Swiss-Prot record, chain A:
Record-given protein name: Ribonuclease pancreatic
Broadest EC class assigned to this enzyme: lyase
Active site residues of this protein: 12
Main location: secreted
Organism: Bos taurus
Molecular function GO labels: lyase activity; nucleic acid binding; ribonuclease A activity; RNA nuclease activity
Residues of the full protein shown: 27 to 138 of 150
Keyword Metal-binding: no
Glycosylation: residue positions: 1, 7, 34, 37, 41
Annotated S-S bridges: 26-84, 40-95, 58-110, 65-72
Amino acid sequence: KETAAAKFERQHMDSSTSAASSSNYCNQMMKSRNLTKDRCKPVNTFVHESLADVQAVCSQKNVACKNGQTNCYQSYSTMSITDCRETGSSKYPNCAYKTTQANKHIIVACEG
Amino acid sequence: PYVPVHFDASV
């Protein structure tokens, strides 16, 4: 089965672009990454950085996850990210998203 | 190795 690490890359990594290039980015990426297969994932974030840079977050600032778990880490640096959020017109299987470009610190959960 | 398995939030 797909590993949790591999699932992370598929759902959130986009090292081939520096940032979302058009309003259609979310629509295209959510579809192509198979995130809309069973239902419309309501929210999703893509990171436009090298995988190594994102993997290094696991050795940066240790913080509590939103749910209280203690294996979260916050990037020391801000990263180029794209926020994908479902639109009022979204209706499975024609999932629709609004694309929002940003530069912020990311918080990931790490395992090993 | 210790790698990211979940995206928790952007701050």
